[PDB]
Subunit: 144 residues, 3 copies
Amino acid sequence: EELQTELYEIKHQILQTMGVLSLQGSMLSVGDKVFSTNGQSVNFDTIKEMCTRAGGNIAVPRTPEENEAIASIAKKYNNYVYLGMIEDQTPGDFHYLDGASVSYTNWYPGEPRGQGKEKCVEMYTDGTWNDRGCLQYRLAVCEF
Amino acid sequence: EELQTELYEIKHQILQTMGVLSLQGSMLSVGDKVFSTNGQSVNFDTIKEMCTRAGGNIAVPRTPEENEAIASIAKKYNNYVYLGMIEDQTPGDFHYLDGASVSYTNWYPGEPRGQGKEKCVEMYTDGTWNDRGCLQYRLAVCEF
Amino acid sequence: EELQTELYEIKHQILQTMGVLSLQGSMLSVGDKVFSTNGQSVNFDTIKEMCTRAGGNIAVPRTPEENEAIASIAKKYNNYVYLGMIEDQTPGDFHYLDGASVSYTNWYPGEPRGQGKEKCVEMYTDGTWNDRGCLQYRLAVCEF
Ligand SMILES: [Ca+2]
Ligand SMILES: [Ca+2]
Ligand SMILES: [Ca+2]
């Protein structure tokens, strides 16, 4: 009886706080995922660290819509973004950080291809991907 | 049994996040309404768009307290604010965006009055209102 | 049946908003406490006011971990922080704002000591404390 009311007020309040964050441009909601960046441009590992420290994970799009969302953040900060995936042993193949193998992909024509073992994946401001070193300075985007 | 505890922790956490946003000056709470602006000064339609895109609606005070809250944001950013209301067909009469007719009002002495059909409503930094064109650049304030 | 799902989505959402705030560096979570500052440097009373106005209270560490958390904020803004405690009648003794007597302490060697009745407590960027006047300009840190 009380529950119903409380759940309502709680939901309203969460929507309000998320509404404020969205309006401030501090986050992007896409389905159940929330993307956000603190505007910093660091290398891969550094990014992984920050995201996990905030309670999240380095972003990785698993659908065209998620991909576009990250691309808009890349565009907004005019910088490339490191994605949550790395090249397996057998070149040309990449996997999600946990271990699963990349499902959705948006490689720029001709990619993946490059000199290097265990390469990272950066996203161009147009959304397409490119594989390369993990020591560049990329916009740190996280997903929660 | 578990519920009671969880609801408590959830409420605490929401209060914390709202407390942080309030302290940062990112929002103002007045009753069940939360007001917020991203500091941008755009015309009416533009404002409507932004607010709805964030999951909210262009602000509209329905009580002296709500009115003052928006006025403080107008004062803080030293800019006038477009309110969520527009002039009906029969001049001098305004309605809430949905359709209902404006209830609470705080017109500046002598207002409303002006050359124009379907005019917008701006709030002066002192809180009083004035009706005029919808193409000026006003502080975008939303309510959630 | 529905509850279980809703509680889950609600928890997820709260974690997301807190994750965004953490990533933006707007807050620090330590156990059930959340610390945050709006970067302002004001005197004691002023600080008390701001925190309560935001729905919180001037920060006070009650454990080494809380202490370090506030110290990191002090370090980040390169400014000393006023803590939530004041000297009792009998010099050398301090109490929490409510009234309870200070439990955890991290005085800088030789402290507390100084000319003054009812003194405040500032935290050095290294985390140790020092008692002195309440009219200095210190970083306003709140806990929620
Ligand atoms: Ca490549
Ligand atoms: Ca007028
Ligand atoms: Ca002293």
